[PDB]
């Protein structure tokens, strides 16, 4: 059975985008330093102009989640009056299930991503065929996209600041796998596991 604990960004003068990015960073770190990927991440509240003031971690295993929220970052921010932590609350039956899927489409929709796509096609052209001309490919005159937050991230193996984005959408209230990617994302390559508010 799912269990969750929540934390609220107490200061009013703060970028909750940056705070959520740091939270996802420590979450990913724990998901590697340890092999488990049980715990997902959910935002109880979401606004079209900014991510919510609270972030709630949802996991099928209680012990793993509690051990995760004992990480050094959380402890050293707790006594600084910048974080407020809830111990644990069982998932209510009245909660709703939505998925915070990460969107890889924007990384290709952007201009440098389009250039990367064309370069990848050029490299994959080693599969024998007539040499294509880049002049044929062109960018769309107009592009319309739904609301997203694009929290932000920095790679550790190499100094590349790739920015991750998540789009919220409702899904079927049942999925028993309880698996996620390196970060809680509800867009795991295997399946799009929902998370509760």
């Amino acid at each position: 059975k799912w269990y969750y604990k929540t934390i609220t960004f107490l200061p009013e003068l703060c970028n909750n985008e940056s705070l959520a990015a740091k939270c996802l960073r420590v979450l990913h770190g724990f998901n590697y330093q340890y092999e488990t990927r049980n715990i997902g991440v959910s935002f109880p509240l979401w606004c079209d102009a900014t991510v919510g003031k609270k972030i709630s971690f949802v996991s099928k295993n209680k012990i793993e989640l509690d051990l995760l929220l004992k990480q050094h970052y959380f402890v050293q921010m707790e006594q600084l009056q910048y974080f407020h932590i809830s111990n644990t609350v069982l998932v209510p039956e009245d909660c709703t299930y939505v998925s915070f899927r990460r969107c890889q489409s924007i990384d290709k929709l952007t201009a440098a991503g389009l250039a990367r796509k064309i370069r990848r096609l050029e490299k994959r052209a080693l599969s024998r065929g007539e040499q294509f001309d880049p002049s044929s490919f062109a960018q769309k005159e107009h592009t319309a996209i739904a609301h997203y937050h694009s929290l932000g991230e920095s790679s550790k193996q190499t100094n590349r600041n790739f920015r991750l984005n998540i789009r919220m959408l409702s899904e079927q209230p049942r999925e028993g796998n309880s698996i996620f990617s390196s970060y809680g994302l509800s867009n795991s390559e295997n399946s799009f596991q929902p998370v509760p508010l």
Binding site: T110, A111, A115, D133, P134, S135, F137, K140, T143, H147
Partner: protein, 294 residues
């Protein structure tokens, strides 16, 4: 002193700058930009992958429309200004203004920030009337970086001469057609003019498709940046304006000394520190044109 009606017409007439993309086959296609909107409009313009070099072309035409005022309520100030122009031309000459206006054409100042991270960019122009080969400048970044570097060109004296004749003789006219070649890095940012209203560019349809553009007025500002020449020394980035009316070196506080300047230009050798610079500013404002009604 200022008559109720006094208007001048611009002598320098820049045109729009149209960007072209050159492919390795040397075929040219108009540059295009993407527009992104959220459900606020943000516009992105980058060099497509595989493009050889961006090409920008525009035409600037000089004319002798500063000889006499376009409109003039009173005849006295009309002949005053005409005599002032004649005396300045005869005593100081158009060489300084011509060189300052021509350097911005040749050094790529009109490209604004588009030349920031380009490896090398060339400026080649075909003047009119002309009787030989096109004037060509190669690798402005390293070769032509100073007045001496420009003057050491093969025919720098010839091109600057036709501007002097155009400014001096009535009906005289010189037309240039500039063509820049920018070897920008792969998928480098191109910064065109943004329309008055977020980031949204000015666009004109070329060959059936929209293209980013640099406004004609915006290019004129870069060509006329010789001091930007204006009634007051207005600075765009830092809000404060130099040549404030309190400083006594604006256009009007200088224009109203026309009789004194006429006396000075004809009596003895003018000082190169104060009077010559004031004369340069006055004629630079006259070339720009405008209305000096009140």
């Amino acid at each position: 002193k200022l008559p109720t009606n006094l208007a001048y017409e611009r002598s320098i007439d820049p045109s729009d700058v149209c960007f072209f993309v050159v492919w390795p086959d040397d075929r040219k296609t108009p540059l295009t930009y993407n527009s992104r909107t959220l459900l606020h409009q943000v516009d992105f313009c980058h060099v497509p992958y595989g493009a050889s070099h961006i090409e920008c072309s525009f035409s600037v035409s000089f004319s002798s429309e500063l000889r006499q005022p376009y409109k003039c309520n009173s005849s006295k100030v009309k002949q005053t200004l005409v005599q002032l122009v004649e005396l300045y031309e005869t005593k100081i000459g158009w060489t300084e203004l011509a060189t300052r206006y021509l350097m911005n054409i040749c050094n790529g100042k009109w490209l604004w920030k588009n030349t920031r991270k380009a490896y090398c960019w060339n400026i080649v122009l075909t003047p009119w009337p002309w009787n030989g080969e096109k004037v060509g400048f190669e690798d402005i970044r390293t070769n032509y970086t100073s007045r001496q570097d420009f003057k050491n060109n093969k025919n720098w004296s010839a091109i600057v001469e036709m501007i002097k004749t155009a400014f001096s003789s009535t009906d005289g006219l010189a037309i240039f057609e500039v063509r820049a070649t920018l070897h920008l890095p792969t998928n480098a940012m191109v910064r065109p003019s943004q329309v008055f209203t977020s980031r949204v560019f000015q666009s004109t349809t070329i060959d059936g498709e929209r293209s980013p553009i640099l406004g004609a007025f915006k290019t004129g500002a870069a060509i006329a940046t010789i001091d930007r020449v204006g009634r007051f020394g207005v600075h765009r980035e830092d809000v404060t304006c130099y040549r404030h009316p309190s400083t006594g070196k604006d256009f009007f506080s200088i224009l109203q000394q026309a009789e004194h300047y006429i006396e000075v230009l004809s009596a003895n050798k003018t000082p190169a520190q104060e009077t010559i610079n004031d004369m340069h500013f006055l004629m630079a404002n006259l070339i720009k044109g405008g209305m000096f009604q009140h």
